[PDB]
Design a protein around this ligand. Sequence first.
Ligand SMILES: CC(=O)N[C@@H]1[C@@H](O)[C@H](O[C@@H]2O[C@H](CO)[C@H](O)[C@H](O[C@]3(C(=O)O)C[C@H](O)[C@@H](NC(C)=O)[C@H]([C@H](O)[C@H](O)CO)O3)[C@H]2O)[C@@H](CO)O[C@H]1O
Ligand SMILES: CC(=O)N[C@@H]1[C@@H](O)[C@H](O[C@@H]2O[C@H](CO)[C@H](O)[C@H](O[C@]3(C(=O)O)C[C@H](O)[C@@H](NC(C)=O)[C@H]([C@H](O)[C@H](O)CO)O3)[C@H]2O)[C@@H](CO)O[C@H]1O
Ligand SMILES: CC(=O)N[C@@H]1[C@@H](O)[C@H](O[C@@H]2O[C@H](CO)[C@H](O)[C@H](O[C@]3(C(=O)O)C[C@H](O)[C@@H](NC(C)=O)[C@H]([C@H](O)[C@H](O)CO)O3)[C@H]2O)[C@@H](CO)O[C@H]1O
Ligand SMILES: *[C@@H]1O[C@H](CO)[C@@H](O)[C@H](O)[C@H]1NC(C)=O
Ligand SMILES: *[C@@H]1O[C@H](CO)[C@@H](O)[C@H](O)[C@H]1NC(C)=O
Ligand SMILES: *[C@@H]1O[C@H](CO)[C@@H](O)[C@H](O)[C@H]1NC(C)=O
Lengths: 164, 164, 164, 321, 321, 321
Amino acid sequence: GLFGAIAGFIEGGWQGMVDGWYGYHHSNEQGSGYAADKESTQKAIDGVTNKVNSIIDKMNTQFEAVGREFNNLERRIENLNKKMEDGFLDVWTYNAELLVLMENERTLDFHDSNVKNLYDKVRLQLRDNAKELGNGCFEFYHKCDNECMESIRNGTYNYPQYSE
Amino acid sequence: GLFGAIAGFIEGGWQGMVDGWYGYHHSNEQGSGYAADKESTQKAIDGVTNKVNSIIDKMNTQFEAVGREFNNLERRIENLNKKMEDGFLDVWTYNAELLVLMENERTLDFHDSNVKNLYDKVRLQLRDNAKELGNGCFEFYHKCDNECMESIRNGTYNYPQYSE
Amino acid sequence: GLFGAIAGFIEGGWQGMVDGWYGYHHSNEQGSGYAADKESTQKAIDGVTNKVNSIIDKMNTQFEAVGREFNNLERRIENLNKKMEDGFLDVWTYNAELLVLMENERTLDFHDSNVKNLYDKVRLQLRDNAKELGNGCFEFYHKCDNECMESIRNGTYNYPQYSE
Amino acid sequence: QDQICIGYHANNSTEQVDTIMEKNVTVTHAQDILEKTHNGKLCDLDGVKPLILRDCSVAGWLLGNPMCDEFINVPEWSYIVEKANPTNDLCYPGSFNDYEELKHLLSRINHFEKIQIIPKSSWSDHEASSGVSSACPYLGSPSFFRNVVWLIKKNSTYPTIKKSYNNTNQEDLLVLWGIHHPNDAAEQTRLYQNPTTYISIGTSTLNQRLVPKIATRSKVNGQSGRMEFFWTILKPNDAINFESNGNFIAPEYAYKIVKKGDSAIMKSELEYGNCNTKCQTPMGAINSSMPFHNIHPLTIGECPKYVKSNRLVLATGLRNS
Amino acid sequence: QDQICIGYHANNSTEQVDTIMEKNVTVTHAQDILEKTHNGKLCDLDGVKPLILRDCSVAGWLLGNPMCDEFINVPEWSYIVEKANPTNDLCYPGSFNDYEELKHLLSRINHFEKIQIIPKSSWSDHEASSGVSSACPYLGSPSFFRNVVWLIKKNSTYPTIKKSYNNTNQEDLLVLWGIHHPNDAAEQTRLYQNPTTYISIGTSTLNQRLVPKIATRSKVNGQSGRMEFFWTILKPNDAINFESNGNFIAPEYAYKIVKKGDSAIMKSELEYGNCNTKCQTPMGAINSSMPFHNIHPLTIGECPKYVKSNRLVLATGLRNS
Amino acid sequence: QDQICIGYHANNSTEQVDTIMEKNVTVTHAQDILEKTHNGKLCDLDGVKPLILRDCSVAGWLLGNPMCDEFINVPEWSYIVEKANPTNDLCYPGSFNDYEELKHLLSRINHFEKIQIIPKSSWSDHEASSGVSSACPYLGSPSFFRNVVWLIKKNSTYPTIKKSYNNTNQEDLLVLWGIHHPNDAAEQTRLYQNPTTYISIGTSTLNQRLVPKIATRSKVNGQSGRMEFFWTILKPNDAINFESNGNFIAPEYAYKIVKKGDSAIMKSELEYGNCNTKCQTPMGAINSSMPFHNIHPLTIGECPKYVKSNRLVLATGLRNS
Ligand SMILES: CC(=O)N[C@@H]1[C@@H](O)[C@H](O[C@@H]2O[C@H](CO)[C@H](O)[C@H](O[C@]3(C(=O)O)C[C@H](O)[C@@H](NC(C)=O)[C@H]([C@H](O)[C@H](O)CO)O3)[C@H]2O)[C@@H](CO)O[C@H]1O
Ligand SMILES: CC(=O)N[C@@H]1[C@@H](O)[C@H](O[C@@H]2O[C@H](CO)[C@H](O)[C@H](O[C@]3(C(=O)O)C[C@H](O)[C@@H](NC(C)=O)[C@H]([C@H](O)[C@H](O)CO)O3)[C@H]2O)[C@@H](CO)O[C@H]1O
Ligand SMILES: CC(=O)N[C@@H]1[C@@H](O)[C@H](O[C@@H]2O[C@H](CO)[C@H](O)[C@H](O[C@]3(C(=O)O)C[C@H](O)[C@@H](NC(C)=O)[C@H]([C@H](O)[C@H](O)CO)O3)[C@H]2O)[C@@H](CO)O[C@H]1O
Ligand SMILES: *[C@@H]1O[C@H](CO)[C@@H](O)[C@H](O)[C@H]1NC(C)=O
Ligand SMILES: *[C@@H]1O[C@H](CO)[C@@H](O)[C@H](O)[C@H]1NC(C)=O
Ligand SMILES: *[C@@H]1O[C@H](CO)[C@@H](O)[C@H](O)[C@H]1NC(C)=O
């Protein structure tokens, strides 16, 4: 993990979060549950789908492979044709594989980055009014109903509160 | 935004900052204004200019395109010549486009990273003596003249101060 | 430095740390010394060695270079053969160079990222019980023997302690 | 006390991907973009069936090899399938000038229609009904190529021939003819009285003068004699002119190129399955939305891009455990 | 209370770029690196003007087609512009051996200087002033190729010719000659008494023996006869040797390759504008510092690299709003 | 008070690398992956020594140029080294048909064994001991190509020859022969009484009829005459048939292709050093574990991949100061 988030300081993933990729787990006086962060998840899906389609669109003008015949005394240009189509085959195969690997990495670090950024979106909302447990959770110093939870989810967290 | 800085927790850019790419906005008892962070901006410009020139320098040995003639009974090697120059054309066009996209991304995340790093350069200078407003500003607990502002700009911030 | 760690807020490297790439410097009542962080360093070495071998393995199917002869009235296909092998030479040379540059960058930002992540691994262990000096060190509010140092190294840091 | 936590999705998937620094990385979601499966059949290409020569080559087909009477009248095709080693080619030994160059022409043609341009009955002053050999047996009796006619002397005399054909059609004409190289002078005289023979052929652009090459050669299919075939593409309103005093294997049937277009010639041992595809390889057809495949380079139709890889998986989901 | 803030630059720009994950991203600064504009004119190349054959081909030019008298004396050129379909080529029907291979030679030559190596007046025992045809009319009267001479019999007799030329020059010599293929024996006799003719040609490396091909062919420009032209490059101090008893279209003017070097042959319908460039395409010249362009593959001069893209913009500035 | 610090490794290294944004970046550790050094010698290739023709070409070698008697009997080789400009090639002027195409064949052959297929003593009715020239002097006396024999008339008469050879061997046979083009008719008669000569050659697939080309040509090595050599590959059990009434340069020794396989033909001015390698370039051999090199494109053996770069260093360590 490049950013330390996925499989780092956040040691694991949520099997119980099924409504998207990212989200929150709340546990207050009105029950406990997993919610999925809409807009970040969406922007991620946009990123990766647009990425796949980008990769495809970048390889619609590849190399064809027409077959050519040569006689018993045209061994040279036959060899040339072979060597050259085989050549292009090698280069485009290389391009596809390498691009795929690179963008796989870029993708994983992309998800990692999104998790990091969410964690900071919430952390900067709850300055003193919450404590870092360390494992990716924020513990409340006050009692926080489902509406405060939602205000943190949609970003409309009303900070004006005590803490001791 | 990969690092959350540009168009993230810092919601917007400064139209009023015209002396460079990065900088600070101060608002104290001796007036209010935008200053531009010299060395970071410079190192960025170096990065991206050297990047452009790098990309160019990586494509001075491309593929030419000499024309060749073939008769009515040389359709095969004519087809080969065509298919092969068209082939190289496809591969170098691919290379240029793909490289451009990739380095565009690398560039944006590069600026994002520079903003992040500046924000931390100042944050680590003003430990307790300032509060995180959250939107990318640090509020002073003490009164800070233009010289403290400059000391923070050039990195020579004298920390020895109270805060309550 | 992309993450601000190497040659950024941590201004320099340790000549005295010779047991690996990353680690810690402790200075307590039982002596002062450099220790090397085992698993992170190892995972890094894995990353970069696997990277080198990956790059090599991605270039075992390159382009050969068989020589071909052509007479005084076969100037055209001679020119074609030349232009095409020279072409492939250009494209594979390009590929190797460009890949190398890119992965050099990816490597440096990879080390930077590892340093950042370690710094956060320790920072999240020592919440209040230590102060950020700013230069990449954590100062203890309590007296910390070699065993607390080790507990921080291997991640088994027993937090339950005072600080004033 | 209340609390709130940040985390990420995990699930029950085993799909692995590979990166530059780490291989076989397990993820929640992944997308294969590599098609690795074919049907093993040669199918119709967009509804129109390909011409599959069985054990026939293009030479044997077009010259009218008797053993190729399966293809006397071939309808419009999509692509052409020839085996690697057709058993039925030049039943009578010899050669085909610019054969490969003609095969290349076939790649831009979807339909010939054979038409008699010179009736066999028209040779009043020669024999056109004795041009047979045991090297080309049809049904156990000595025969020959159908599209051409092997003239020999009549009443101990082979008069000079001045035969011509004006392409009055609006289509291009593939015209084929040949020359017989005997193996001794006695044979040359025996078949075509004149000892020193030739065949002159002219069009707007064509100007050639063949002479037979008497020479001692080994037996191929029981004959030491050879046939050498030549061809040309007659333009509409253009005419072809033959003058010969011997060894002349005359045209009889020619082919009207009535439908040009992007076609191809496949090499494949496979035979026709009764299917239909938008993409065809020599070893099977493809039905996939996948952008890549690793079946065969030589591909025809509306197809994915061929790649040498054994495995290409793109990472859609995140890191799982 | 005092405060300090961190932020980034924004401005009033609409320049978009594209990334792998996000398209049409707006930024503060951006740099186009793709040249997409030409002048539509064929210009001088580094001050030296190209040889532009109008409706002339290389064949028609070099053989001295009368309709190509515009180019009897061509100065040093940069590149060569030929149209796709030159109307004036082989005014008298026939062929040019290894034509494409000669055109390829022109790519390494910047200047020929024509010199008379065989004066028309030197043919005492033949007619060199009656070698004309209506297939090559100049100003409404039957003419012929200027650089060569069509010898015919004199006083009902065509004696064998033994003409030779020693390249005493220090330059390479492009030497051209030809053979006349008549359409009947009566014509062969009519022009060159000898029924069975030939033309032998020898140098240090050259050893060939042409014989005419009498054959019935169709009319091109009103003639059923054909001319076939051959060429060679005579080394300095090397000599060329002709022996012939008929059908010989002799050389008269040859070309001294006095200036070699990197040149080219362009195909273009465009004509000469009065301009100057360091980079020339067949559809226009380029004046740009841009590293790329998308105008034409076939490029000559000090030029940017051609690329198929319609749009390439590199991101210099950061994300704007 | 106690404290703990986080940092990274530094050391005493000066190895620089290059990135996309920053060049000449100093690091603690780095890995060169580019081999830039050779031995300057042509070595054995996996223990088996290459055939190095000194100033001999393939033509001169195989035809049995006397000045090439160093290679009368060549053992199994790995690759073949020819100089750019071999001084000893066709000692007697003329040509070698499909020479390049034969050189290409050599790339798949590791060993010929020369065998006499036609003894010089067998020409009872002709002279086979007077086929010499001063254009091919061996030890200061007029000689000729050893592998072939230049027959001339005996007792003022050159009878027609009907010589044949059945390849009874289980190996393919490279068979070479030739034709002599004289420079006048008097010479033609002088050497081979018959004024109008030819050489017919036939196999299963071969059917050719050479005729000499009398022509006036310049002197190469003091002779205006020319030799043109032809070749073919005789299959096992196949036979070759010669019929000729003159100008026939007959085969005598032929080469059994007894060891096929991946070989090559190198162009190099270098001579044999006494070494051994797994990778050979025309300018030196390579012994490296490096994956790349920048020595020469044309590489043979178990070799690294050639690349144009002058410097390729991969960054293993981190940023140092
Ligand atoms: C015991 C005995 O004497 N047997 C002969 C027997 O040799 C002979 O057979 C003929 O052999 C000749 C060559 O010697 C040819 O090979 C003939 O075969 C063919 C063929 O079948 O194609 C025969 C054919 O009839 C010929 N057609 C014409 C128009 O001539 C062709 C043609 O000549 C070849 O292509 C020539 O190159 O030859 C074969 O009949 C028979 C008949 O002569 O008589 C026996 O007594
Ligand atoms: C009503 C009538 O009888 N009309 C004839 C008329 O046919 C004839 O014209 C000649 O026709 C012949 C073929 O039959 C040629 O085509 C002649 O044309 C040319 C040409 O112009 O190039 C003529 C030219 O003078 C010839 N030059 C020489 C040296 O012979 C060439 C040359 O022969 C061709 O290239 C041959 O292939 O032919 C054309 O004059 C005229 C004159 O004979 O008489 C009418 O009565
Ligand atoms: C003063 C004087 O008269 N001198 C003659 C002198 O010219 C002549 O030398 C012969 O010159 C002829 C051509 O005129 C040939 O060039 C002969 O050279 C060769 C050769 O050495 O290869 C000679 C050789 O003996 C010939 N071999 C055969 C089988 O004929 C070949 C061969 O003819 C050529 O390859 C032909 O193209 O020619 C050269 O001897 C001598 C002898 O005639 O007499 C002097 O008096
Ligand atoms: C063929 O016939 C047409 C008219 O039917 C005629 O114009 C043309 O000249 C003829 N073709 C030739 C080559 O003579
Ligand atoms: C041409 O002349 C030179 C001397 O002027 C002579 O040496 C040379 O042999 C001649 N060329 C030929 C091929 O005879
Ligand atoms: C050569 O000899 C074999 C038997 O030894 C025979 O079968 C074959 O026909 C002969 N080759 C030819 C071409 O005649």
